[PDB]
Amino acid sequence: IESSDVIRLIEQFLKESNLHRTLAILQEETNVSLNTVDSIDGFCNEITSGNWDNVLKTVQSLKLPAKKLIDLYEHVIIELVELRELATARLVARQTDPMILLKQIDPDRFARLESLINRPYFDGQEVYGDVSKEKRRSVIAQTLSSEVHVVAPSRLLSLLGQSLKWQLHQGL
Amino acid sequence: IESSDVIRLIEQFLKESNLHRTLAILQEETNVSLNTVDSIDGFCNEITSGNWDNVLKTVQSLKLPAKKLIDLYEHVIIELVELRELATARLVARQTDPMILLKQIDPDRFARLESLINRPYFDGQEVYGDVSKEKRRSVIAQTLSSEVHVVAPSRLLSLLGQSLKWQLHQGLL
């Protein structure tokens, strides 16, 4: 007899079958969720390409702990103030779990982030001078790549295929 | 939308796992439902007890052909006229598919049924005299029980168990 593992098998099946509605209700009702990404490349690429809305939604979906996300969320804010999305930058700084944590453990570091947001303009030559934008994005992607797990596609159907092969064998 | 049997495997699992919320959404989103019954006993008891609303709903779920339902729907009408629910009795005889089929195929039998419906009173001695009320219910239950197939509980888990047995056979490498 298998346990919660059956549910994750089903969840993967639902995602690949585009049954996202059923997938949503299942995760809520069972208190079990997919801890997987389609590919490590694809996940890291989003960070490398700077598509922050995608990576933020993704990491929150995987429910990674706040401590691992502190570097990522800090950089997201730096790029947001760079794009002069000050309202959004402040929003990330005020409401998100990693930033609330950052304030608690390293208030000095949070304070520097506070000052960066409040500067009359963003000078990338000053901010990125020690370590470039590309390097910061690359480092965050590398560390996070070990924190996400990929599973083989269609695990449920593969297992069911094995069931059929067993039955053909056992029929003899 | 390709694996309709797989969805039903999942649906049964959801039902046995008390995930009724997920089960409802799955049926709605996929537009497929279980065509199986948990047990003939539950099915036969519903017919024996005369819970026709349930039996009609169950039989409608299984998408049984009208001919097998002709005897059942006829008996329902007989019990309706027994309770002197003539308006409902006339309604069922004219509007439901099995009775409409009955008129086309066996108008004499249908005529006898309408004659029964239009009678000033219900004579239990004639109707149940030849074959009793309880016996008629048992016969219909017996015939319909054979027209429905039962599936083993927890089929998904059983198949997954076979997957592991296969892996023990060839998966270890």
Swiss-Prot record, chain B:
Known partners and oligomeric status: Component of the spliceosome B complex. Homodimer (via LisH domain). The homodimer interacts (via the N-terminal region including the LisH and CTLH domains) with smu-2, giving rise to a heterotetramer.
Outcome reported for the amino acid change (mutating residue 91 to R): Disrupts interaction with smu-2
* Gene field: smu-1
Q: Which intervals hold domain LisH?
A: 2-34
Spell out the family assignment given in the record's similarity comment: Belongs to the WD repeat SMU1 family.
Q: How does the entry describe the domains?
A: The WD repeats assemble into a seven-bladed WD propeller.
Give the tissue specificity.
Answer: Ubiquitous. Detected in the intestine and germline in adult hermaphrodites.
Residue range from the parent sequence: 6 to 178 of 510
UniProt function note: Involved in pre-mRNA splicing as a component of the spliceosome. Selectively regulates alternative splicing of unc-52 exon 17. Thus, smu-1 mutants selectively suppress the effects of unc-52 nonsense mutations in exon 17 by promoting the accumulation of unc-52 isoforms that lack exon 17 and enhance the effects of unc-52 mutations that affect the exon 16 splice donor site. In contrast, smu-1 mutants do not suppress unc-52 nonsense mutations in exon 18.
Return the annotated region ranges for Required and sufficient for interaction with smu-2. 1-173
What's the effect of swapping residue 10 to A? Mildly reduces homodimerization
Q: What is the effect of changing residue 13 to S/R?
A: Disrupts homodimerization
Domain named CTLH: residues? 36-88
Please state where this protein is localized.
Nucleus
Any idea what this protein is called?
Smu-1 suppressor of mec-8 and unc-52 protein
Supply the source organism's classification. Answer: Eukaryota, Metazoa, Ecdysozoa, Nematoda, Chromadorea
